[PDB]
């Protein structure tokens, strides 16, 4: 009775990894604090063939590093359990990244009634790698910690450095930006990291709304940015997009 | 740190001010934890059943 709970208490690290390998069926991501402690992860960070600021960087981000590393079971016996922990190795570090959010943009004019209302399909993460931009279209391969962006180049596309002209022009003659088109006006809001883009065209009525001051703005026929420190909700037609994270009551 | 610009010419907001860490390769590590064995029978049978079920996965 005491020895079974002693077996539980000495082997906390061993029963949890067998459970975590059963549930994920051999291949486990993200790696846990049972699969690898912080001291062992730090001593392994000091071991990798990388420069010193890379080691400091993975020491400051020991949560995102765990969220990018797999751990594949290799050999299990009655008294030994073995698994390869595939810790990430970053090739380049400390080069500027940026996340591109887009929104529908109708070329509204009442002179003729000819609107085409583009949208850019190349939203996602971009980083500088080797003098050329490495672009990540998936929203799951890149993880952010408050100034830092961590991606992977497994299936990442590699675009030239002249894709920044995609931010101010679609038909710029230096890169062909990914664009889908329409033929009638559409209206939706795209919440961003530090704000929200609101496109309001046609007969749609979109009103911004501060948390305390009520309606403070009425969007015209046009695409307008609005910060997450100036408004709190945006109503487009009947959809109430929430620009900020709505605070709620706590629990105990 | 993060500055988010907005370009109304394409209706896109760009969140600049980040610093990269682009994964390029792997770093394997063979971690081998040994069983803290015990000489109660049902717990050992449960652990050996788990070990057998994980062995048949390969």
């Amino acid at each position: 009775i005491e020895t079974v709970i002693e077996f539980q208490q000495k082997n906390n690290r061993l029963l949890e990894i067998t459970r975590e390998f059963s549930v994920n069926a051999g291949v486990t991501t993200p790696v846990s604090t049972y699969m690898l402690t912080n001291s062992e992860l730090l001593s392994l960070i000091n071991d990798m063939p990388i420069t010193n600021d890379q080691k400091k960087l993975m020491s400051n981000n020991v949560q995102i590093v765990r969220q990018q590393s797999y751990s594949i079971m290799s050999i299990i016996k009655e008294e030994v359990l073995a698994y390869v922990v595939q810790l990430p190795l970053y090739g380049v570090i400390d080069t500027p990244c940026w996340k591109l959010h887009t929104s529908p943009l109708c070329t509204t004019n009442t002179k003729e009634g000819s609107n085409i209302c583009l949208t850019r399909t190349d939203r996602g993460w971009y980083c500088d790698n080797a003098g050329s931009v490495s672009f990540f279209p998936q929203a799951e391969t890149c993880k952010v910690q408050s100034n830092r962006v961590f991606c992977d180049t497994m299936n990442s596309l590699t675009l030239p450095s002249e894709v920044n002209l995609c931010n101010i022009d679609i038909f710029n003659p230096k890169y062909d930006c990914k664009i889908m088109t329409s033929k009638t006006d559409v209206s939706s809001s795209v919440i961003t990291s530090l704000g929200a883009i609101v496109s309001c065209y046609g007969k749609t009525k979109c009103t911004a709304s501060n948390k305390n001051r009520g309606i403070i703005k009425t969007f015209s026929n046009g695409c307008d940015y609005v910060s997450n420190k100036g408004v709190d909700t945006v109503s487009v037609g009947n959809t109430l997009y929430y620009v900020n994270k709505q605070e709620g009551k706590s629990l105990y | 740190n993060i500055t988010e610009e907005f370009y109304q010419s394409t209706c896109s907001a760009v969140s600049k001010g980040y610093l990269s860490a682009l994964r390029t390769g792997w770093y394997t590590s063979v971690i081998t934890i040994e069983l803290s064995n015990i000489k109660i029978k049902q717990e050992l049978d449960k652990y050996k059943n788990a070990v057998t079920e994980l062995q048949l996965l390969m």
Partner: antibody
Amino acid sequence: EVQLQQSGPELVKPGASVKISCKASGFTFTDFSIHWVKQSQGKSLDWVGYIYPYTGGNGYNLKFQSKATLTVDTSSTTAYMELRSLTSEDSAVYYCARREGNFVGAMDYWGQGTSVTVSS
Amino acid sequence: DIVLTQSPASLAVSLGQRATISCRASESVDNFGISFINWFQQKPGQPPKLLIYGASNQGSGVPARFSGSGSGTDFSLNIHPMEEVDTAVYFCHQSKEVPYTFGGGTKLEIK
């Protein structure tokens, strides 16, 4: 409103690299593209090149690549045109265009026109 | 290189009538359904000024007498009614891809 000043007419000896300055006041300089258009003496509006001042990105028509070097100064909101190895065929007028793109309203308002007279 | 042919060369239109100018592109300048043709007007001693953009729309502060029409490889600029102040050279500029090409331009002096 949006206005584009340009440098005065220059009278230059051949073979000298000259600089045309186009000052833009009244809009956001990192949202448009200052195109350069050369009109000769009584002919059409021959295109020269483009500069997007958001990145300083330059491109050319493929008969002005060995002739023009188009630069920006985004802090002074100014476009510059460096003309190298000038001949009698470059005595013309040059225009800077604000050139809203992306399902365009293209070339809204223009510069007043720099007249470069190249002769001995 | 999308070369554009603009017709005619010199256009004589009576005071108070309809004047049309054709611009035939050699390739399709349409991009995702809408054309990229801009019609400019240049008085002598003056920079060219936008009149028509997108081959249909009207520029900021342009009276309705100027109108764009057409699609594909054929476009038309229509000026009606005609005044004494609208004497200039007009240009049809393509905007699809590099290099951008300007038409030869029509000089309309009043008949």
